[PDB]
Ligand binder design. Structure first.
Ligand SMILES: Nc1ncnc2c1ncn2[C@@H]1O[C@H](COP(=O)(O)OP(=O)(O)OP(=O)(O)O)[C@@H](O)[C@H]1O
Ligand SMILES: [Mg+2]
Lengths: 210, 187
């Protein structure tokens, strides 16, 4: 069954289900190894298994499928995807795939996909005739984004000052030049939570490096 | 038939202005209903404020277009009426204003405009002396519905919206903004 719910759950719940599923010596190793072994024994029983993730293609064309919670780690949780899915199913790099998964047979370390059920929150059928990103003609920042919470929060003054100094917009290209000890990290988290609260339709994610 | 063409253009401008104010009012009511909620579509709220600005600017531009079109139509109509009546009764007007016409017949430009101002102010004083009676007169002979359906003055909705003055920079920025508005509406 779906591995995301057992992936985002904390380690305690995973280990407790580990003891109650019949394997009690699966605590002293990595989270990826724990989930790999638990799902291995679970699929060995012969039950329905569901998977999801984001794919990527190596140099040889054979691809991997990583998970967002694992921070795209090259652990056993990844799923093998063949170039044939790309060649006929017409799936590009990084397409979010959710659907059936196959327990790998002997000599196969990583899982495989049986069939695809959802691609980029859309049906896999109409994803074939999808316009490319670079083929779209761009324009300037037509839309305007407001960073004010509107509830009079105790920290809304920072967002209001940011709006007054430099309004932000959709599809804009902006930089925040700052020396160290500038308080930038928490103002980025503040604008992130502001756009999450004000705009529940647009997708939000934050990239952390080193 | 230039008169009828002018009337058709004036009516087209009036209808366009009326439907522009119709979509304007629709825009304000829709924006108000969407603003009744809190934080639902803040980006769409800003877009609605922008569309309100665009619609009001375009309504002002259409109102100005209609005002100048109506002024031109009235000017042409009064020119035609005065011209026809004046061919009918120009001899008596010339007789009552003979010295100025002898002055204009052969004199130079400075004396020409001197006779011009003499004739004009003499007829102004005659007109202001006569109009003390203040009698009521109907429209022209064949220009009844011309002066009926067009209207004596532009509607009161055309004077409260044209008082806002926009600089050419505002006009051009709103024109290009409406340009991308039309581009989006095409899609
Ligand atoms: N709006 C604010 N309200 C309160 N304190 C603020 C505000 N902006 C900046 N500061 C202060 O500025 C300092 C910056 O702290 P913080 O750890 O957020 O910085 P940072 O720029 O994200 O860090 P670094 O550059 O070291 O990674 C803190 O002392 C913080 O209290
Ligand atoms: Mg920081």
């Amino acid at each position: 069954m779906n591995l995301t719910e057992l992936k985002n759950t904390p380690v305690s719940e995973l280990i407790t289900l580990g003891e109650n599923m019949g394997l009690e010596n699966l605590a002293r190793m990595r989270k990826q190894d724990i989930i790999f072994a638990i799902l291995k024994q679970h699929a060995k029983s012969g039950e329905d298994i569901f998977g999801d993730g984001v794919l990527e293609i190596l140099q040889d064309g054979f691809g991997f499928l990583r998970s967002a919670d694992s921070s795209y780690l090259a652990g056993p949780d990844d799923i093998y995807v063949s170039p044939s899915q790309i060649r006929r199913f017409n799936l590009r790099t990084g397409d979010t795939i959710s659907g059936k998964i196959r327990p790998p047979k002997e000599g196969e370390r990583y899982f495989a996909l049986l069939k695809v059920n959802e691609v980029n929150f859309d049906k896999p059928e109409n994803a074939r005739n999808k316009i490319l990103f670079e083929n779209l003609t761009p324009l300037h920042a037509n839309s305007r984004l407001r960073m004010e919470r509107g509830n009079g929060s105790t920290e809304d003054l920072t967002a209001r000052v940011l709006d007054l100094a430099s309004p932000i917009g959709r599809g804009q290209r902006g930089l925040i030049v700052a020396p160290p000890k500038a308080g930038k990290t928490m103002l980025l988290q503040n604008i992130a939570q502001s756009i999450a609260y004000n705009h529940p339709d647009c997708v939000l994610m934050v990239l952390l490096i080193d | 038939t230039a008169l009828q063409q002018a009337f058709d253009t004036c009516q087209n401008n009036k209808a366009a202005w009326l439907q522009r104010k119709n979509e304007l009012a629709a825009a304000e009511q829709e924006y108000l209903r969407l603003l009744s909620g809190e934080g639902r579509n803040v980006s769409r709220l800003d877009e609605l404020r922008n569309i309100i600005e665009v619609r009001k600017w375009q309504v002002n531009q259409a109102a100005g277009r209609y005002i100048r079109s109506h002024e031109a139509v009235q000017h042409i109509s009064i020119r035609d009426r005065l011209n026809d009546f004046m061919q009918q009764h120009g001899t008596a007007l010339a007789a009552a204003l003979a010295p100025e016409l002898m002055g204009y017949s052969e004199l130079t430009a400075i004396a020409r405009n001197c006779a011009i101002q003499r004739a004009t102010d003499a007829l102004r004083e005659a007109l202001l002396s006569w109009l003390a009676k203040g009698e009521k007169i109907n429209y022209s002979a064949q220009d009844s519905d011309i002066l009926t359906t067009i209207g004596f003055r532009p509607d009161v909705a055309s004077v409260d919206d044209s008082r806002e003055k926009f600089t050419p920079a505002q006009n051009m920025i709103f024109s290009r903004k409406s340009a991308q508005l039309a581009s989006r509406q095409s899609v």
